[PDB]
C-alpha cells in the first residue's frame, strides 16, 4: 500500500509539473483521476477507441502481481524465509550486499509509505471538489472561492450527498 | 495429461494401483486415426465438398470471424462438430482400450 | 437413384474376386473347422462363398454407385 | 475362549453393504468358524465371499447379520463351529453365541429361566386394575 | 538402427538379410514372422517391377486383338474382363504350383525353402540386394505412374516428353 | 533455495541446472502438472518451428522465389497462406511435416521411456557438435534463439495484423 | 488389472475404493480443498469457504429475483444474498451448540471452539465475497448482462 501510494503521490505532482510529448493532445486538459476515466473511454472493452494505456499498465502490473502472489502464499505458510516486501530489487547497491536493506532504511520506507498513503488520499479528495490538482490547490490556500471544473468520476453516486446533507460550498 | 507414457509422478488410477494413462500417445493417435478417414470429401451441403474434419475446421473459422455471435440453429457448425466429436470420443475410447489393455 | 448396370463380365470379375478373397479369408479366420486341402469341407466352402456373394454384391453396387462399375 | 484377532478373514472384494461409523463408535460383531474347504458363500451384506480352509473371521454391524450368516453356514456347509462375539470400541470383547457352549435349542443345566410366567396368557390382569399402580399385569 | 538413427535397432533383422538398412520404425518385424515379411517384400516387388514395364509397353506396342483404351492403365476397362479373370486364376494356379500346397504362413517355409528362392537360381548377396532394391524403387514408381496416367489421362512417355503438366484432380 | 530468475520465489523442484536453457523460471509451477521431459521436447519443437517462421518472414520480405509473384501479387505474410492453400503449396508442406511427425511420435515415446534425450533426432550432418564443448554452447544457443523467435514470430504477425506490410517494411515506413 | 478394491484394505467396511473415490487426482483435490487442507486454522478454512460461497450467491438473486428488471436489482441481489448468509450463519451457530461439548482444544473443526471459529470466518468471508461480487457487477457491464453487451 505504501509503495503504490508513493508512486501515486509523485505522479500526481509530476503530472501537474509537466507531461510527456503528445499526451496533452489526446487526453485534453483532464488532470488526475479524470485522465484515468478519459483513457478508459478511449480503450477497447472499457469504451470505444484506439488507446490501450490503462489496459497495458494492468497487464504488465498483473504479470508482476501473480509472481508476487505466489511469494505471499509461500511466506504465509512458512515455506520461504523471505521477510515482507523483500523481493530483492536493489540494482544500484544501497544495502551494501543485501537487497533487504538496513533497519534504518526500512524504517524510512515504511514511514514515507504511510505518509504517502495519507497524502495521496488528500490529493484525490481535493481534486474531487476543487478540481485543482496538487500544485494548484497548494497555490490556492483559500479554496472554494475558485473552483476549476472537473469531469465526474466513474463512481459518481458517492458524490451525491454533498448538496443534500453536506453544505455544498463548492 | 495427468500421466504421460512415462514413470514421472506416482499416479494411481485408484487407491493402490498405479496405471499409466497414455494421454499423449492415445490423444495424438486417436486424433490422427479419426481425422485421416474423416478427410474423405462428399458433395453434400453439410460438408460442402470437403470432408467432415475439413468442414468442421472451416466451420470453426467462419464462426470465429463473427466471434461474439454464436452459430445459429440451422448453421452447419452444430451438426459437423457433434458428429466429429462423437467419432473422436469413440476412437479415443477404443484407442485407450487398445493401447492400455493390449499394450501392443 | 444410384446407378446400376446390366450384368457384364466386369460384374462377374468383381464377384469372382470377392468369392476367392473370402475363400482364402475363411481358410484363415474360421476358428472351428495343404493350405486349402486340410479340413476344407462343404460347410466351410458354402460359408465363404455365401460371404463372397454378400461382399461381392456390396462391392458391385458400390462401384456402380461411384462410377468405377 | 477370547477372540484371536489374528484369524484370517474370508476373501472378499468389498461392498457398500458393510459396517458404517456406528460400528467404530458404538459396537461391532464378529463371527468365527471353521471350514473344511475353500468354498464360496453369500455375505449377509451383499455379494459372495470365499471362506478359507481352516479358521475364518468376519466383522458385521448387527447381531442378526452374524446369526443369518451362521444359519447359512450350518444349513449349507454343515459348519456348527461358529462363535459370535460383541466388540466394543474400548477393546472389550463379549462372547455371545452359543452363550454356554451349547446351542439354545438344546437344554442345558445351570440355565435359569427368565421371563417365565406361572399362569396362562388369559389370566393376566386387566389394565384398569393396575392403573396408577406399579403392579405388573402378569398376575 | 542405421536408417532412422534416433530410433532403436529393430533387433529382428541383420545384415545377413539382403536389404538390411535397419529400417523398421513401426516394429512390424517383431509382430510378424520375418520370413513371411521377406517373402512378401520380394513378391510385391516382383509384381510391381513387371507392372512398371507393363504400364510403359502398351503406349508403344499393343496387342491387335485388344483395344488401346486411351491409357495403358485405363485399358483394363476396354479389354474383356474374362481375360482379366483368366489372369487372376492363372496367377493363383501358378502360386499353388510354385508354393506346393503352401498358402499360409505356417505352411510356407515348412520345407526349409528361402523366401525369394523358387528354384530358378542361387544368387550372391550382392545380386540379391540388387533385386530387392530395384523392386522397392519399382513399387514406389508404379504408384507414381499409375496415378500420373489416371490424373492426366495421358501416357507417361507422352507427358514426360510433352507438357509435363502437374497432376491435378 | 530460491529461483535465480525470480529471487523471491522458491526454486522449482522439477527443474534442474543440467537442462539447457534453465533459469529457474517456472513461477506457476506448470512442470508439476505434466512430465518435464514432455515439456522439454515441446519447448524445443515450438522453438524450431518459431525460428523457421521468423526467418521466413524476414526472407519473404527481402525476396521471393521465381514465379511466386505471379500467383501472389500483393499478399505479404498470412495472406499468401490462403491463396497457396488452394494452390496446394501449403497442402504439400502439411503432408510432409505430418509424415515427419509420425516418426516424431515414436521419438517422443522413446523420450518418455527415458532412453532418448528430449529434442534429439541425431541430425548433425556437418559435425558441428563433435568437440562436445561446442555442443553445450550450441544446445543453449538453440534454446535461447528459439525462445526469442517465439516472441519475434508473434510480435511480427501481430504487427502485420495492424500495419499490413511485414516486419522489414514496418521498420522502413511506420 | 482391477480398479475397484476394498476401502483402506478393509473388505467389510461400508465403502469401496473406486477411481472417483480414491484416485490420485481425487486425493489431490480433496486434500487441497480448504475444509481438508493442512496447515489451516478453522477460522481460515471458514474464510476461504465463505468467500467462495458468498461470491457466487449474489448472482442468482440478482439475475432472477423479483426486482431483476428494476434499476435496484443489484442492491436487492446483495441484500437477499446477505439475508440468506445471515440465516446460514444461524444454522451454523445452532449446529455448533448442540453437536460439540466444550473442551480446551481449538485447532480442529469438530470441536466447539473450532466450529465457532469456522462460523466467524464463514460470516466474514461470505459478506466479503458477496461485497466483492457486488462491486464487480456494479462496475463492469459485461457482468450485468450475461455477456450480452458484446452483441
Ligand atoms: C500514453 C501516453 C501518451 C500518449 C497518448 C502519447 C501520444 C503521442 N506522442 Mg508521446 N510519449 C509518451 C506517452 C504518450 N504519447 C511517453 C511516455 C514518452 C516518452 C517520454 C513519449 C515521447 C514522445 C515523443 C518524444 C514524441 C511523442 C509524440 C507523440 C504523438 C505521436 C505522433 C506520431 O507521429 O506518432 C508516431 C510516433 C512514434 C512512432 C514515436 C513517437 C502522439 C500524439 C511525438 C509528437 O509529438 O509528434 C507529433 C514525439 O515527437 N511522444
Ligand atoms: C474407432 C476406431 C477404432 C476401432 C474400431 C478399433 C478397433 C479395434 N482395435 Mg484399435 N485403436 C484405435 C482405434 C480403434 N480401434 C486407436 C485410435 C488406437 C491407438 C491409441 C488403437 C490401438 C489399438 C491396439 C494397440 C490394439 C487395438 C485392437 C483393436 C481390436 C480389438 C480391441 C478393441 O478395441 O475392441 C474394439 C472392438 C470392436 C471395434 C468390434 C466390436 C464391434 C462393436 C460394434 C464396436 C463398435 C464401437 C463403436 C460404435 C465403433 C465406432 C466407429 C467410428 C464411428 C468411431 C479392434 C479391431 C487390438 C487388436 O485386436 O489388435 C489388432 C490391439 O492390440 N487397437
Ligand atoms: C468397394 C465396396 C463398396 C463401396 C464403394 C460402397 C459404398 C457405399 N455403400 Mg456399400 N457395402 C459394401 C461395400 C461397399 N460400399 C459391403 C462390402 C457391404 C456389406 C454387405 C456394404 C453394405 C452396404 C449397405 C447395407 C448400404 C451401403 C451403402 C453404401 C453407400 C452410402 C454410404 C453412406 O454414405 O452412408 C452414410 C450414412 C451414415 C450413417 C454415415 C454418417 C456408399 C456409396 C448404403 C446406401 O445408401 O447404398 C445405397 C447402404 O444402405 N453399403
Ligand atoms: C486365385 C488367386 C490367388 C491365390 C490363391 C493367391 C495366393 C497367395 N498370394 Mg497371390 N496374387 C494373385 C492371385 C492369387 N494369390 C494375383 C492375381 C495377384 C496380383 C498380381 C497376386 C499378388 C500377390 C502378392 C503381391 C502377394 C501375394 C501373396 C499371396 C499369398 C498370401 C495371400 C493369399 O492367401 O492370397 C490372398 C489373395 C488372393 C486370393 C487374390 C488376390 C488378388 C489381388 C490382390 C486382388 C485384391 C483385391 C483388393 C485389393 C482386396 C481388397 C480387400 C478389402 C478392401 C475388401 C498366397 C500364396 C502374398 C505373399 O506373401 O505371397 C507368398 C504377396 O505378397 N499374391
Ligand atoms: C510454392 C512456391 C512456388 C510457386 C507457386 C511457383 C510458381 C511458379 N514458378 Mg517458381 N520456384 C519455386 C517456388 C514456386 N514457384 C522455388 C522454390 C524455386 C527454386 C528456387 C522456383 C524456381 C522457378 C524457376 C527457375 C522458374 C519457376 C517458374 C514458375 C512458374 C511456372 C510457369 C511455367 O511456364 O513453368 C510458376 C508461376 C518459371 C517462371 O516463369 O519463372 C520465371 C521458371 O522458369 N520457378
Ligand atoms: C522480440 C519481441 C518483439 C519485438 C522486438 C517487437 C517489436 C515491436 N512490436 Mg511487437 N509484439 C511482441 C513482440 C515483439 N514486438 C509480442 C510477443 C506481442 C504480443 C503478441 C507483440 C504485440 C505487438 C502489438 C500489438 C504491437 C507491437 C508493436 C511493436 C513495435 C513498437 C514497440 C512497442 O510497442 O514497444 C513499447 C514498449 C514499451 C512501452 C516499454 C517501455 C515494435 C516494432 C506495435 C507496433 O507499432 O506495431 C504495429 C503494436 O501495435 N507488437
Ligand atoms: C527501491 C529501489 C529503487 C527505487 C525507487 C523509487 C521510484 C522510489 C520512489 C519514491 C517516492 C516517489 C516516494 C514519495 C513519497 C511521497 C510522500 C512521502 C508525500 C506524500 C504527500 C503528502 C504528505 C501531501 C500533501 C498535499 C495535500 C493532501 C493537498 C495537495 O493539494 C497538495 C499537498 C502535496 C500539499 C531504485 C531503482 C532507486 C534502486 C534501489 O536500489 C532500490
Ligand atoms: C528372375 C530371374 C531372371 C529375370 C527376370 C525379369 C522378369 C526381370 C524384369 C525386371 C523388371 C521388369 C524391372 C522393372 C523395374 C522398374 C523400376 C525400378 C522403376 C522405374 C521407374 C521409375 C524409377 C520412375 C518414374 C516416373 C514416375 C513415378 C512418374 C512419371 O510422371 C514420370 C516417371 C516415368 C519418371 C531370369 C528369368 C532372366 C533368370 C534368372 O535365373 C532369374
Ligand atoms: C482512479 C479513479 C478513482 C480513485 C482513487 C483513489 C486513489 C482514492 C483514494 C482514496 C484514499 C487513499 C483515501 C484516504 C483516506 C484517509 C483518511 C480518511 C484518513 C486517514 C488517517 C487518519 C484517520 C489518522 C488517524 C490518526 C492520526 C491523526 C494520528 C494519531 C493516530 C491515528 C489514529 C493513526 C476514483 C474513485 C476517483 C474513480 C475514478 O474512476 C478514477
Ligand atoms: C514472461 C516474461 C515477459 C513476457 C511476456 C509476454 C506477454 C509475451 C507474449 C507472447 C505472445 C502473447 C505471443 C502471441 C502469439 C504468437 C503467435 C500469435 C504466432 C502466431 C501465428 C499466427 C497468428 C498465424 C495465424 C494465421 C495463418 C497465417 C493462417 C490464416 C489464419 C491466421 C490466424 C491469420 C517479459 C516481457 C516481462 C520478459 C521477462 O523476461 C519474461
Ligand atoms: C484398377 C484395378 C484393377 C483390378 C482390381 C484392383 C486390383 C483392385 C485395381 C488395382 C488398383 C491398383 C494397382 C492400385 C495401386 C495403387 C498404388 C501402387 C499406390 C502406391 C502408393 C504409394 C505411395 C502413396 C508412396 C508413398 C511414400 C511415402 C508415404 C514415403 C516414403 C518414404 C519413406 C517410407 C522412407 C524414405 C523417405 C520416403 C521415400 C519419402
Ligand atoms: C470452470 C469449470 C470448468 C471445468 C469443470 C468445473 C471445475 C466444474 C467448472 C468449475 C465451476 C465452478 C463451481 C467454479 C466456481 C467458482 C467460484 C464460486 C469462485 C469464487 C470466487 C470468489 C471470489 C473471487 C471472492 C473474492 C472476495 C474478495 C476478493 C474479498 C473482498 C472484500 C474483502 C473481505 C476485503 C475488503 C474489501 C471487500 C470487497 C469487502
UniProtKB/TrEMBL annotation, chain C:
Which protein, by its recorded name, is this?
A: Photosystem I reaction center subunit PsaK
Gene assigned in the entry: psaK
Q: Which organism is it from?
A: Rhodomonas salina (Pyrenomonas salina)
Is Transmembrane helix one of the keywords? yes
Superkingdom of the organism of origin: Eukaryota
Record's keyword terms, sorted: Chloroplast, Membrane, Photosynthesis, Photosystem I, Plastid, Thylakoid, Transmembrane, Transmembrane helix
Q: Name one GO cellular component term.
A: photosystem I
According to its UniProt entry, the protein's GO biological process terms are: photosynthesis
Which segments cross the bilayer?
11-30
UniProtKB/TrEMBL annotation, chain D:
Annotated membrane topology: Peripheral membrane protein
Q: Which UniProt keywords apply?
A: Chloroplast, Photosynthesis, Photosystem I, Plastid, Thylakoid
Looking up InterPro entries in the UniProt record yields: PsaD, PsaD_sf
What is its subcellular localisation? Plastid, Chloroplast thylakoid membrane
Q: Does the keyword Thylakoid apply?
A: yes
Question: Which biological processes are named by the entry's GO terms?
Answer: photosynthesis
Q: Matching SUPFAM superfamilies, A to Z?
A: Photosystem I subunit PsaD
* Main localization, broad class: plastid
Its job: PsaD can form complexes with ferredoxin and ferredoxin-oxidoreductase in photosystem I (PS I) reaction center.
- Please give the PANTHER family that the UniProt record associates with this protein: PHOTOSYSTEM I REACTION CENTER SUBUNIT II, CHLOROPLASTIC, PHOTOSYSTEM I REACTION CENTER SUBUNIT II-1, CHLOROPLASTIC-RELATED
Protein name, entry field? Photosystem I reaction center subunit II
From TrEMBL, chain G:
Q: Which organism is it from?
A: Rhodomonas salina
Where does it primarily localize? membrane
Membrane-topology descriptor: Multi-pass membrane protein
Domain annotation Photosystem I PsaL reaction centre subunit XI: ranges? 4-140
From the Swiss-Prot or TrEMBL record, give the protein name. Answer: Photosystem I reaction center subunit XI
Subcellular compartments: Membrane; Plastid, Chloroplast thylakoid membrane
Annotated binding of chlorophyll a 1, by residue: 35, 53
- Give me the Gene Ontology terms describing cellular component: chloroplast thylakoid membrane; photosystem I reaction center
Q: Which GO terms describe its biological process?
A: photosynthesis
**What SUPFAM superfamilies does this protein's entry cite?**
Photosystem I reaction center subunit XI, PsaL
Classify the source by domain of life: Eukaryota
**Keyword vocabulary terms for this entry:** Chloroplast, Membrane, Photosynthesis, Photosystem I, Plastid, Thylakoid, Transmembrane, Transmembrane helix
Stored InterPro entries: PSI_PsaL, PSI_PsaL_sf, PSI_suXI
The UniProt transmembrane annotation reads 72-98, 118-143
Residues annotated to bind chlorophyll a 2? 37, 48
Q: Does the keyword Thylakoid apply?
A: yes
What Pfam families does UniProt report for this protein, alphabetically?
PsaL (PF02605)
Question: Record's family?
Answer: Belongs to the PsaL family.
